[PDB]
């Protein structure tokens, strides 16, 4: 099972400098050996075989080379150590002992399974151990997706492989907003192309002024023209240079692992577009196609390892509750217990709930058949029995559990069934939990309830589409069109009355002409009626495709039907760009949790995209890996990670290096939070310094890829700049060098805060929402600048935060002896941006501040102080700490800046312009409200306590004035905005 700690031994965070290791020799001998904890297995083996000469049977032993070490890990599994480069402290040993064995099977296979099992966070042998046919069928059948993905990576073999490793990180549309076009003069960009010229690996630059719509090949062509101009070559030979070498070269961003490998316009490239925006010179590096292609390895993928029909069944649903083996009830307080049941389609019941008879908790035996008012034929595919053992004190559930009435092979569930129940969540007031985990608790040490399903003549299977279509094909005014258009526009949280529900269903054929009403129409179907469902199935089959952002909603909790979900996936397969799939990957991962079965069209889609683009693959890995602690998803995510790791290629080795690094960090912070807890910062720092200096750490934490962004190589640690942050939870401020040749032209430092203790999912979601808001604004042609900084959750309340270079909190600048007036911030900017630079800085401030004023209002981000609002040197404002009736907020500090230093900051054309930015930005978000609503709704399944119900989402319905008119919404917002130092430490008066 997965490891409890990040410790060097079970129950020990850090093994001593020298330790005694029990060595079990192949001649049946036991030798105690004293080893350095940082000792490699190569050293320990040598040391041992030397010592072994002193003990009996030494003559039996063959060369050290003929053997391998084996031990039991903290994961309770027998590990074979093939890579004897690994240090004693880094083998996740349970007890300090090692066994000498002759290697058995085939190295290659065992090595890969070790590398997979480590990255997943649980051994592959544990999947082999699972006897469930659905699990084993998933394992075999998902390989079809792997083989298909690996085949496209090798089709156009050199370029296609480079394309997988370095996918173009390019914007959504090639079309540039006019406000951005106006920034680049004559519709042209001044670019700098660098070359590392041999001998002596000297740098040479070539400045080019060319159109932004230029393909990278045209950029190379113009560079090769600049170089050949002095050569005395004829027009025909000059043209032939371009003709033969135009594409013998590749472009890379300086100080980055970002390559311009595809035909997209230069401006479309995310690096270039930010440069155009920032008025910075884009520095690119020219390289030989072969220089890149020599780096690419992998693509060495190896393969591992009578029916009767439903609704021919003229019967009402019968389910026999038998016995429940134990319940932990205080017999003095609770006498009787009963099994409460319900047949559900998602979170909605298909019929009235049925209870068993009240029984004495001393004998939890019912042996009763329960009768549901639903015909067997009417059961939808996705119907589930939701049950719970309730107490009678006044009712309350004690344990709960849900089962799918049909299995993955479309077979209606028949026979006896033992269901290990789940404990009731904290705050679950309801007697049943239908939006819970459908399946029996993997913990067999829990109350288990035996069940019995009807056994009809033979095997009962859900009908074919041929059968459904044949049953469906058996079974307009002026105001009516306006009425449908009204329902269409309404947000997904706007309640549709049973009268509107009847109206949509009665007009279902017209609804095809207005396709974006499919989610409202699907909620109007009686899912408890095969007569209605069969007709709906047909409509979905031939339903026109809808925007991915619309189709994503069909994948949340409200839409459990496989046909609906299938349609949704097909829209994403046809319309979702890699850019946008990366933009909505967080939600797309959570929404897998709502799938009835392991092998489905969503998993198959997401997996292929991840094995097709390493940017997607990387975050698909980390998003799934971070949830490997949650046992309600452990198996599904584990099996998924196994299939990804098996087919991702060499990236698994980089992922293992990142996992190794994080494990050391989690362990060092656990030590600081636990044993060392009560030690002064001075003391704790001396320990940190001692620890980071150790070989194993220097090896682990130096020379790997940033999990926050793999295009950033983390070189050697700048130990002088590394520290334990003064704040509670003990975050680690880590600094690394940039190993890039052109590290000077982008960023020489790589700063990350590693934080153990706090849940970073809120921060992660808010930062994603901010990025989306900026993309809406920037697309609409509104230059509102946001800083959605890097933030990644790597496990249970462990994560990483990108340190924004050249930033300071409003508090830090106010303390720059220690006398601050509401003018301090403006005076700071005035000084950091003197001359013609001033105007630009104040503009960036107003554009960024406007964006944040609106975003924080809409979302309802409160507790905003001068110590959680930061400002870059260039003038850019941004907020931090997003762990959470919030009004509009605009400090006089900001007002003073916006108004370029003025006494009446409300009566200026600056503030007028600022207010205009805020209105325009707010109305832009209100127009895309369904997206925000849908994104948050796809997040209900995840463990996020701030998002447990739709009632939590209802806040955005309020701030965006969704029930209101657009002018009434504008009026509301305008009112909120117009409504709007001594004792700054505690705030008293």
């Amino acid at each position: 099972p997965p490891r409890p700690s990040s410790g060097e031994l079970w129950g020990i965070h850090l093994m001593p400098p020298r330790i005694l290791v029990e060595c079990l020799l192949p001649n049946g001998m036991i030798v105690t050996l004293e080893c350095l904890r940082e000792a490699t297995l190569i050293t320990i083996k040598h040391e041992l075989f030397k010592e072994a000469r002193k003990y009996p049977l030494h003559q039996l032993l063959q060369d050290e080379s003929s053997y391998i070490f084996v031990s039991v890990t903290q994961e309770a599994e027998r590990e074979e150590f093939f890579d004897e480069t690994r240090r004693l402290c880094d083998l996740r040993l349970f007890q300090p002992f090692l066994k000498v064995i002759e290697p058995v099977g085939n190295r290659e296979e065992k090595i890969l399974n070790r590398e997979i099992g480590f990255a997943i966070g649980m051994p592959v042998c544990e999947f082999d151990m699972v006897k469930d046919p659905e699990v084993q069928d998933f394992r075999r059948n998902i390989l079809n997706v792997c083989k298909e993905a690996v085949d496209l990576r090798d089709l156009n073999s050199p370029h296609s492989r480079a394309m997988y490793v370095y996918p173009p990180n390019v914007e959504s549309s090639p079309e540039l907003p006019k406000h951005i076009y106006n920034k680049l003069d004559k519709g042209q960009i001044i670019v700098v192309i660098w070359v590392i010229v041999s001998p002596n690996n000297d740098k040479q630059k070539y400045t080019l002024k060319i159109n932004h719509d230029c393909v990278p090949e045209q950029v190379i062509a113009e560079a090769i023209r600049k170089k050949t101009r002095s050569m005395l070559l004829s027009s025909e030979q000059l043209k032939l240079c371009v003709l033969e070498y135009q594409g013998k070269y590749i472009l890379k961003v300086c100080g980055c692992d970002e390559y311009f490998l595809e035909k997209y316009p230069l401006s479309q490239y995310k690096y270039i577009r930010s440069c155009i925006m920032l008025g910075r010179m884009p520095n690119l590096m020219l390289m030989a196609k072969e220089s890149l292609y020599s780096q690419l390895p992998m693509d060495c993928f190896t393969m591992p390892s009578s029916t009767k029909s439903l609704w021919v069944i003229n019967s009402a649903l019968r389910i026999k509750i038998l016995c429940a083996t134990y319940v932990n009830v205080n017999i003095r307080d609770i006498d009787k217990i009963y099994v409460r049941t319900g047949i559900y389609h998602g979170g909605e019941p298909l019929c009235d709930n049925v209870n068993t008879q009240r029984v004495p908790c001393s004998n939890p035996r019912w042996n009763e058949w329960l009768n549901y008012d639903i015909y067997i034929p009417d059961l939808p595919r996705a119907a589930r029995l939701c049950l719970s053992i309730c107490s009678v004190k006044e009712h309350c559930p004690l344990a709960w559990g849900n089962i799918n009435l049909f299995d993955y092979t479309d077979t209606l569930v028949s026979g006896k069934m033992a269901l290990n129940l789940w404990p009731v969540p904290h705050g679950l007031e309801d007697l049943l939990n239908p939006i819970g985990v459908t399946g029996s608790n993997p913990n067999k040490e829990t109350p288990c309830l035996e069940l019995e399903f009807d056994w009809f003549s033979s095997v009962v299977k859900f009908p074919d589409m041929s059968v459904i279509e044949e049953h469906a094909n058996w079974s307009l005014r002026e105001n009516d069109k306006e009425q449908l258009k009204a329902i269409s526009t309404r947000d997904p949280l706007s309640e549709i009355t049973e009268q509107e529900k009847d109206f949509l269903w009665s007009h279902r054929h017209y609804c095809v002409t207005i396709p974006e009403i499919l989610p409202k129409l699907l909620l109007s179907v009686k899912w408890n009626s095969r007569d209605e469902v069969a007709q709906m199935y047909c409509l979905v089959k031939d339903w026109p495709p809808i925007k991915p952002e619309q189709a994503m909603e069909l994948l949340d909790c409200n839409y459990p039907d496989p046909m609906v979900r299938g349609f949704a996936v097909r829209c994403l397969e046809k319309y979702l760009t890699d850019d946008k799939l990366s933009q909505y990957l967080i939600q797309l991962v959570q929404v897998l949790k709502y799938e009835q079965y392991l092998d489905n069209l969503l998993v198959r889609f997401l997996l292929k995209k991840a094995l097709t683009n390493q940017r997607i693959g990387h975050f698909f890995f980390w998003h799934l890996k971070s949830e490997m602690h949650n046992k309600t998803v452990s198996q599904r995510f584990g099996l998924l990670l196994e299939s990804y790791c098996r087919a991702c290629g060499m990236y698994l080795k980089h992922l293992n290096r990142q996992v190794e690094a994080m494990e050391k960090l989690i362990n060092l912070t656990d030590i600081l939070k636990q044993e060392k807890k009560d030690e002064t910062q001075k003391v704790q720092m001396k320990f940190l310094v001692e620890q980071m200096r150790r070989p194993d750490f220097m090896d682990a934490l130096q020379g790997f890829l940033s999990p926050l962004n793999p295009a950033h190589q983390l070189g050697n640690l700048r130990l002088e700049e590394c520290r334990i942050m003064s704040s509670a939870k003990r975050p680690l401020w880590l600094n690394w060098e940039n190993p890039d040749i052109m590290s000077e032209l982008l960023f020489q430092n790589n700063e990350i805060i590693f934080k153990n203790g706090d849940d970073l999912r809120q921060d992660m979601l808010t930062l994603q929402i901010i990025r989306i808001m900026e993309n809406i604004w920037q697309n609409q042609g509104l230059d509102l600048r946001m800083l959605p900084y890097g933030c990644l959750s790597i496990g249970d309340c462990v994560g990483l935060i990108e340190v924004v270079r050249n930033s300071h909190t409003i508090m830090q600048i106010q303390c720059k002896a220690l006398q601050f007036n509401s003018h301090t911030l403006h005076q700071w900017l005035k000084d950091k941006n003197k001359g013609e630079i001033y105007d630009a800085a104040i503009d960036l401030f107003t554009r960024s501040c406007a964006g944040y004023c609106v975003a924080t209002f809409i979302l309802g981000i409160g507790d905003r102080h001068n110590s959680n609002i930061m400002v870059k040197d260039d003038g850019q404002l941004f907020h931090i700490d997003f762990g959470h009736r919030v009004p509009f907020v605009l400090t006089q500090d900001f007002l003073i800046v916006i108004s370029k230093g003025a006494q009446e900051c409300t009566k200026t054309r600056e503030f007028e312009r600022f207010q205009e930015m805020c209105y325009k930005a707010y109305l832009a978000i209100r127009q895309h409200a369904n997206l925000f609503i849908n994104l948050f709704s796809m997040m209900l399944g995840s463990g996020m306590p701030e998002l447990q119900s739709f009632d939590d989402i209802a806040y955005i319905r309020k701030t965006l004035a969704l029930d209101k008119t657009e002018q009434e919404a504008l009026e509301y917002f305008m009112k909120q905005m117009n409504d709007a130092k001594m004792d700054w430490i505690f705030h008293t008066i």
Partner: protein, 121 residues
């Protein structure tokens, strides 16, 4: 409200004990796997020592035999140390699982009461 201050504190003990129990369960699992490996080592000792014990017996080399015995005794004593360490954990797990049951019994007494109040309030 009064009972909510303690039900929330009680759940805090329910959750920790659950975590701690799952750890003990995997430690026991690792102890079994360790014990199996050490037992497997003895089978390896008997297999190889058989032809050495045989030669030395047919040689009156009682020391070289007693030398193979002293190491087997060490290995055998170590298996007792591990088996007794597993049993110590087994009884600790039993004591904790008894606790997460009494935490549960306590919770299922407060939970129907708290539900009635939230409705009244």
């Amino acid at each position: 409200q009064e009972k909510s201050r303690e039900y929330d504190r009680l759940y805090e003990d329910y959750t920790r004990t659950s975590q701690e129990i799952q750890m003990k369960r995997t430690a026991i699992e690792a102890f079994n796997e360790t014990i199996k490996i050490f037992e497997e080592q003895c089978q390896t000792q008997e297999r190889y020592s058989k032809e050495y014990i045989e030669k030395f017996k047919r040689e009156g080399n009682e020391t070289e035999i007693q030398r193979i015995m002293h190491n087997y005794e060490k290995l055998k004593s170590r298996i007792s140390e591990i088996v007794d360490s597993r049993r110590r954990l087994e009884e600790d797990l039993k004591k904790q699982a008894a606790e997460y049951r009494e935490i549960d019994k306590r919770m299922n007494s407060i939970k129907p009461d708290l539900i009635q109040l939230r409705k009244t309030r």
